[PDB]
Amino acid sequence: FETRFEKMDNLLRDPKSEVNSDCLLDGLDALVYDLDFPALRKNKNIDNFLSRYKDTINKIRDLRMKAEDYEVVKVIGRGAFGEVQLVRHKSTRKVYAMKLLSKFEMIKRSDSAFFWEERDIMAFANSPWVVQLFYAFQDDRYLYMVMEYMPGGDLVNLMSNYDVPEKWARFYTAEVVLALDAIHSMGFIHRDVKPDNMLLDKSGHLKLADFGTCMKMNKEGMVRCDTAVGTPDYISPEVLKSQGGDGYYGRECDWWSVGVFLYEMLVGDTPFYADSLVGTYSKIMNHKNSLTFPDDNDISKEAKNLICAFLTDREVRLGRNGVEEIKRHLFFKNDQWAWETLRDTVAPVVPDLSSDIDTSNFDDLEEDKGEEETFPIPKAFVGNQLPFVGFTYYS
Amino acid sequence: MSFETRFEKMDNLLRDPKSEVNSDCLLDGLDALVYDLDFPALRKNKNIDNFLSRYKDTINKIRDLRMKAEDYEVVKVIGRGAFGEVQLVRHKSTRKVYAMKLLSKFEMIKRSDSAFFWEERDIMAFANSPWVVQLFYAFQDDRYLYMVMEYMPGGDLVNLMSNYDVPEKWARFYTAEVVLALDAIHSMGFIHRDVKPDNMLLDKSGHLKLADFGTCMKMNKEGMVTPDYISPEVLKYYGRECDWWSVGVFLYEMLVGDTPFYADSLVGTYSKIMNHKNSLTISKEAKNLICAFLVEEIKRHLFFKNDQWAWETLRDTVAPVVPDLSSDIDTSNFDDFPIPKAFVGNQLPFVGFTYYSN
Ligand SMILES: Cc1c(C(=O)NCc2cccc(C(=O)Nc3nc4c(s3)CN(C)CC4)c2)nnn1-c1nonc1N
Ligand SMILES: Cc1c(C(=O)NCc2cccc(C(=O)Nc3nc4c(s3)CN(C)CC4)c2)nnn1-c1nonc1N
C-alpha cells in the first residue's frame, strides 16, 4: 500500500510522464474516434463502450483546448505536413505561432514519430536558444503546437533583405554555435541546421524553431541511422551517404551545416548549388574539388579558413574535439561581444514592430487550397489515432 | 466555458470519484487497450504495434503499482454465485479484513451479461448508509472484476432461520430493518427487484445490511421501472411496490418455515405466484401484514407496534442475535479465453470499474 502509492501519483502529475492526466485522456479520446463507425458498432463490446463514454468524451472535447479557442490572424509558415498560423487565444488575448501537422499525411507517408523529440525539446529545454512550446493539443485531423511568436522572421528573409557584412555574419554564426551546443548538451544531434529554422525574437536574437530531425546520441556521442535526413543544400557527406550498415555518425554533421550557412551568408549562394538536385549530391561528395570561393573577394582570410575547417571530411573537421576549438577560431575574435554575454549585446537587426500581430518580417502565403484529404471509413479496426496518444501538453 | 473556468470544470471531472473520466477510469482505458491489442495477428498493424512498443512497458509498471489480487491473503471462501465467489481476505500491507467478491469476465462476455455490476458499484460505494454493505475498493485484471467490501461476520438470514426457531419478536425486528433498508434504496432512486434473506447480512452487532444489488434499476422519469420472492408484475412498467411483495414473502417464510408459493417444480411456483388469490394458505396482525403485501403506511401497521424499539432508533437497540466472535477472521456464521484473429475488445465493458475510496 505505502511501498507503491508514492511512485504512482508522481506518474500522473509529471508533465514529462507518458501516463499523465492529459495523455490518459488522449487514449480514451482516440478510442472513441477509432471505434465510432457503423461496421465496428456491430460488435456488442464496441457499441456498449461507445454508448457509455461517447457523451462524456463530447463534454471533455468541449472543455479541453481546441482550434476554436484560437483566432487565426495570418498564415506565416508552411511545411510538408502542414502550416504555421499567427493566432490569438480568444480568452487570454495572448499571441502565439500555431503549427498544424496533418494526421492523414503522417499515416499515408508512414512518418508519425518525428514530432516526439520536438515536443520534448520545445516544451522542456528552458533555453533562450530554443523556441518555447506552451501547449500541444489535437483533434481527429491535426496535431497542434502553440509556440512563442518570433516577430523578427527567419534568417533566409534577413539574407534576402540585407547585404550581410562579416560583422553581422560573425554574430549569427556565434549564436548558431551556442544554440547547437545547447542541443548537443541535451543529448541530441539536430541534423537539419539551415537558416529557414533560425528565427529572431523582438530584440533580434536567434532561436532554433524546428527539431523534426533531432535524434538522441549514445554515451559515445554517436547515432546509427540508415536513412538520410536534412535539406539537399546543407546535408553533410556522411549523413547523405546513409544506408543500412553505413550510417554511423556524431554531432560534427551539424558543424558542416554551420560552414554551409556561413558561406551562404557571405557569398549569397550555397557552396554546392546546382540546378539539378543530383548535381548538388555530386558536389557535396566531391567537396575536395567542388568548394570554390568567387574571384571578387570581400570575405576575409579567417572567414574562408572557418568555412574550409567545417567543409571537410568528419575526421579532420573543426568541432570533432569539442565546441571550444570552434569558439577559439580567429574568425570569432572581435571587440564588440563575448561568448558568455553574446545574447545580452544589441543584435545587428532589431525588428520595428507596430503591433503584437505585426507580420512584416514574414512573406505572404496562400490560405485556402480548396479541400485537403481525410481517412476513409474503416471496415475493421485500423487505430489511426493510436500513434498520436500522449501528444497533449499544457503545464 | 471559458479559460480558466473550463480548466476548473475539467480538473473536477478528473478528481470526482463519481465521474466516468476520473484518473482510475482513464487508466482502465489504457490497460484494456494493451490487453485487447497485444496479440501477434493484431501486431501486424503498424499503428497497433508502435502504440504497444510505446506503452506496454509503462502499463506493466502501472499494473504492479495499482491494487491487485496479490495484495490480499485469502483466508476462506465464504460465498458463491453464478459468475464467481466471495473470499474472506486480509490486505497484506494494512492487515485489514474484508470480503472480496470475484466476477468472471469470461462468463460475463459469454452470457452477454456485463452491466449488472454498475448499479451495485454505485450503490455500495456511494450510499453512505448503515443499511448498505460498503464497497472500499473495486479493481480488475484481464480475468476478473474484484470488489473489496466490508465483512459481515453475523452471516445471512437464511443461516439464522436454519439455526433458530424465529419468534414473532425477532421477525418484527428483521422485517422493520428490511423496510428501512429498502426505503434507503428507494430514496436513492432505485428498485431492488431481488429482496431475499440470502442477500440480508448481519454485522458484528447483529444489525441488518443489504449486500447484493445485481438486479437494481434506476426509477425512470419520476419512478416507474430470483424465484420465489418474485412479484406477479415482474413475473409478467411497474413501481417500487414489487419490493414490498418480497418483504411479505420473507415475513411468511420467517414465521412459517417455508415460502408461501413453494413447489417442488419451479414451474409450479410460477403458477402459485400468479394465482396468489387462491394459493396463499401466528398472530392476527402478522397474517394481516403478509396479506397486505400479497412508506409510512407500512410503518403504521399494528404488527410493528411494540414497546421494545422505535423506527428512528431501531439500529441503536440490541439485536436478537449478537455474533460470538473469537477473532477478526471468525467464519463460524458461514457454511463450507480464445486468441483473437481481429479486434474484439473483450475488456471494453469493464473500463471505468476501478474505484479507490480516499
Ligand atoms: C514560421 C514558423 C515555423 C515553420 O515554418 N516551421 C516549418 C513547418 C511548418 C509547418 C509544418 C511543418 C512540417 O510539416 N514539418 C515536418 N517535419 C518533418 C516532417 S513534416 C516529416 N519528416 C520529413 C520529418 C520531419 C514545418 N516554425 N516556427 N515558426 C514561427 N514563426 O514565428 N514564431 C514561430 N515559432
Ligand atoms: C458472502 C457475501 C455475498 C454473496 O454471497 N454474494 C453472492 C455472489 C457471490 C459471488 C458472485 C456472485 C454473482 O456472480 N452475482 C451475479 N449477479 C447477477 C449476475 S451474476 C448476472 N445477472 C443475472 C444479474 C445479477 C454473487 N455478498 N456479500 N457477502 C459478504 N459476506 O460478508 N461480507 C460481505 N459483503
Structure explained in plain terms:
2 copies of one chain form a homodimer. With 395 residues, chain A is of the alpha+beta class. Chain A has 2 domains: 1-153 and 353-395, Phosphorylase Kinase, domain 1, CATH 3.30.200; 154-352, Orthogonal Bundle (Transferase(Phosphotransferase), domain 1). Helices cover 35% and strands 14% of the residues of chain A. Chain A contains 13 helices and 12 strands. In chain A, strands 1-2-3-5-4 form a 5-stranded antiparallel beta sheet. Chain A has a 3-stranded antiparallel beta sheet with strand order 6-8-9. In chain A, strand 2 (82-89) and strand 3 (95-102) form a beta hairpin. In chain A, helix 2 crosses helix 3, helix 7 runs antiparallel to helix 9 and helix 9 packs antiparallel against helix 12. Chain A is globular and about 75 Å long. The two termini of chain A are 29 Å apart. The interface between A and B is large, with 50 and 49 residues. The structure holds ligand B4V (2 copies). One ligand B4V binds at residues 78-86, 99, 101, 103, 113, 116, 133, 149, 151-152, 201, 211-212, 214-215 of chain B.
Q: What is the makeup of the main sheet of chain A?
A: 5 strands, antiparallel
The CATH superfamily of the largest domain in chain A is Transferase(Phosphotransferase) domain 1
Distinct helical segment count of chain A: 13
Global structural class of chain A: alpha+beta
Which pair has the most extensive contact?
Answer: A-B, 50 and 49 residues
Question: Gist?
Answer:
The structure is a homodimer. By secondary structure, chain A is α+β, with helices and mostly antiparallel strands.
